[PDB]
Amino acid sequence: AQNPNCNIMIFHPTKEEFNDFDKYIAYMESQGAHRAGLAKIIPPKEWKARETYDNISEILIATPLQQVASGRAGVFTQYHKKKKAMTVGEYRHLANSKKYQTPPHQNFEDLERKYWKNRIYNSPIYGADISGSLFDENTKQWNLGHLGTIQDLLEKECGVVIEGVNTPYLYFGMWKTTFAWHTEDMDLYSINYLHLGEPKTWYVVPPEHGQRLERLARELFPGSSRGCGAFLRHKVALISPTVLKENGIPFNRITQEAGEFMVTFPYGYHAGFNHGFNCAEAINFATPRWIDYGKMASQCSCGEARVTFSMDAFVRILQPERYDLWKRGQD
């Protein structure tokens, strides 16, 4: 078995290898990359997502989210308070203000220590989940707005045509902005490209060990666990590396820098934080290997998780028994 310790793998495709996205994902899996839950892909040196980032300031963040924490430094939840709209130029200036800017630090490890020590005492503002793309239409390789759609994959594998669309999302971050522990909707893959700015640190649990993380989360968030049998779908809970290590949960960590792709694999729990002002683009995707994960994915039916239009069909076709109850949660 390849990669039996479930280490995060880093790949350096050539420009020739960068042509066929599906083929390269399958290659990475042949080497065991999925066992980690997360892989890094450094694009060939000839490749670029677009020519410059000089003209992005007028993108609107219609509903910036202030991420307010509750709990203790290593075990906390966050809720998202909606703020007034602002442009990317306005948000960058905010991120660079004295109140919100990255503190002085020695290296990424020092900054990670400062994040876990101090995150809960601040409420950074995240421009998350903004439909759109920063890939130039002329970028033909690994253009996250030109991927094969999940609906077409389900149709190719299973023969059933379904409604729904699959488009990317932009994320504008600042110091301490945080993504809570989660897997993707329907335990899909994700791909994330860091277009610009400061790094993003990731934590990930191997898919084969995901239920260990779930069990710990039920212990650490016991009221949330009584409320919902899949409360990590709410995307609000944080657990630090120190607490994971104290409880024996297998995980790995890695820092993504501007110009790099990350792929999350089916049922790979992940969480992380931004180092400073940045912009990322991410989208879900599927392969044939996903189908079985989609069929077994947990679902929130308590009503909190509220997701896209397109997840309806996935539940309806892959999880017909759950359909009824899950849809009640969505309506």
Ligand SMILES: O=C(O)CNC(=O)C(=O)O
């Ligand atoms: O970058 C972020 O805030 C969160 N991204 C992801 O969870 C992802 O790409 O799957």
Ligand SMILES: [Mg+2]
């Ligand atoms: Mg603009």
Ligand code: NI
């Ligand atoms: Ni994710």
Ligand SMILES: [Zn+2]
């Ligand atoms: Zn729920």
